[PDB]
Scaffold this active site. Structure first.
Site, mmCIF file in Angstrom:
data_model
loop_
_atom_site.group_PDB
_atom_site.id
_atom_site.type_symbol
_atom_site.label_atom_id
_atom_site.label_comp_id
_atom_site.label_asym_id
_atom_site.label_seq_id
_atom_site.Cartn_x
_atom_site.Cartn_y
_atom_site.Cartn_z
ATOM 1 N N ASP A 1 0.669 -1.028 -0.102
ATOM 2 C CA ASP A 1 -0.089 -0.061 -0.130
ATOM 3 C C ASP A 1 0.892 1.299 0.106
ATOM 4 O O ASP A 1 0.622 2.404 0.087
ATOM 5 C CB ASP A 1 -0.890 -0.040 1.171
ATOM 6 C CG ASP A 1 -0.389 0.017 2.546
ATOM 7 O OD1 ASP A 1 1.005 0.116 2.739
ATOM 8 O OD2 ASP A 1 -1.154 -0.152 3.571
ATOM 9 N N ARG B 1 1.075 6.758 -0.028
ATOM 10 C CA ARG B 1 0.368 5.730 0.669
ATOM 11 C C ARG B 1 -1.070 5.667 0.200
ATOM 12 O O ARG B 1 -1.538 7.022 -0.175
ATOM 13 C CB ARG B 1 0.147 6.171 2.218
ATOM 14 C CG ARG B 1 -0.919 5.306 3.089
ATOM 15 C CD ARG B 1 -0.566 4.071 3.598
ATOM 16 N NE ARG B 1 -1.185 3.249 4.510
ATOM 17 C CZ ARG B 1 -2.302 2.678 4.247
ATOM 18 N NH1 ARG B 1 -2.721 2.615 3.248
ATOM 19 N NH2 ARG B 1 -2.960 2.135 5.415
ATOM 20 N N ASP C 1 -6.146 -0.944 3.537
ATOM 21 C CA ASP C 1 -5.217 -1.523 4.582
ATOM 22 C C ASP C 1 -4.812 -2.715 3.729
ATOM 23 O O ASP C 1 -5.553 -3.732 3.893
ATOM 24 C CB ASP C 1 -5.561 -1.727 5.932
ATOM 25 C CG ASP C 1 -5.712 -0.492 6.644
ATOM 26 O OD1 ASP C 1 -4.912 0.552 6.460
ATOM 27 O OD2 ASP C 1 -6.765 -0.485 7.313
ATOM 28 N N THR C 2 -3.468 -2.917 3.355
ATOM 29 C CA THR C 2 -2.840 -4.194 3.051
ATOM 30 C C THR C 2 -2.258 -4.913 4.013
ATOM 31 O O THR C 2 -1.607 -4.305 4.928
ATOM 32 C CB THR C 2 -2.229 -4.205 1.531
ATOM 33 O OG1 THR C 2 -0.767 -3.383 2.160
ATOM 34 C CG2 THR C 2 -2.711 -3.525 0.616
ATOM 35 N N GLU D 1 1.114 -6.403 5.675
ATOM 36 C CA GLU D 1 2.266 -5.903 5.572
ATOM 37 C C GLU D 1 3.393 -6.863 5.635
ATOM 38 O O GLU D 1 3.163 -7.931 6.345
ATOM 39 C CB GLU D 1 2.345 -4.451 6.617
ATOM 40 C CG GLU D 1 1.744 -3.453 6.278
ATOM 41 C CD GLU D 1 1.857 -2.433 7.311
ATOM 42 O OE1 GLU D 1 3.008 -1.891 7.651
ATOM 43 O OE2 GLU D 1 0.509 -2.065 8.036
ATOM 44 N N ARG E 1 3.903 11.286 4.108
ATOM 45 C CA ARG E 1 3.464 10.615 2.664
ATOM 46 C C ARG E 1 2.211 11.237 1.969
ATOM 47 O O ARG E 1 1.365 11.612 2.600
ATOM 48 C CB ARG E 1 3.093 9.223 3.032
ATOM 49 C CG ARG E 1 4.404 8.337 3.876
ATOM 50 C CD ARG E 1 3.893 7.051 3.964
ATOM 51 N NE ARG E 1 2.875 6.853 4.972
ATOM 52 C CZ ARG E 1 2.335 5.520 5.436
ATOM 53 N NH1 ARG E 1 2.851 4.355 4.899
ATOM 54 N NH2 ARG E 1 1.390 5.810 6.240
#
EC number: 3.1.31.1
Length: 136
Positions: free
Chosen positions: A16, A30, A35-36, A38, A82
């Site tokens: 992500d 970002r 949400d992936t 991690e 980010r």
């Protein structure tokens, strides 16, 4: 009315998070609203489907002819500096593709950065019904 801007891939870092050249400067982006799992997670490290989400994002942006960034209506950077955006690879939103494949969940949403929220939740509900990956 959001608009897409051209950008150039530098490096994909995680499922992500991608490094991109934007308006001539290298920036870390970002992906908004997802949400992936991690590979570079503070606490856990390499969580299940993290390597898979990470390869999917990387292939998708690496094989594209065109990468574009689309900022939402609220803040455009987070507290880590980010960029916060929707990323497109040849016209296809990377954030949605991940969710559609069961490789990301729709994140905690913060107005006003929530323009594509409904669209993503629709894709998320389909991947769950299809029991893909995260949802299997």
């Amino acid at each position: 009315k959001l608009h897409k801007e051209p950008a150039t891939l530098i490096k994909a870092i995680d499922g992500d998070t991608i490094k991109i050249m934007y308006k001539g400067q290298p920036m870390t982006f970002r992906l908004l609203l997802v949400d992936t799992p991690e590979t570079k997670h503070p606490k856990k490290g390499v969580e299940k489907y993290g390597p898979e989400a990470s390869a999917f994002t990387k292939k998708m942006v690496e094989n594209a002819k065109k990468v574009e960034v689309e900022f939402d209506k609220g803040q455009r950077t987070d507290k880590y500096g980010r960029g916060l955006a929707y990323i497109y690879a040849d016209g296809k939103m990377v954030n949605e593709a991940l969710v559609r494949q069961g490789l990301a969940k729709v994140a905690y949403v913060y107005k006003p950065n929530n323009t594509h929220e409904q669209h993503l939740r629709k894709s998320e509900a389909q991947a769950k019904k299809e029991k893909l990956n995260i949802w299997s």
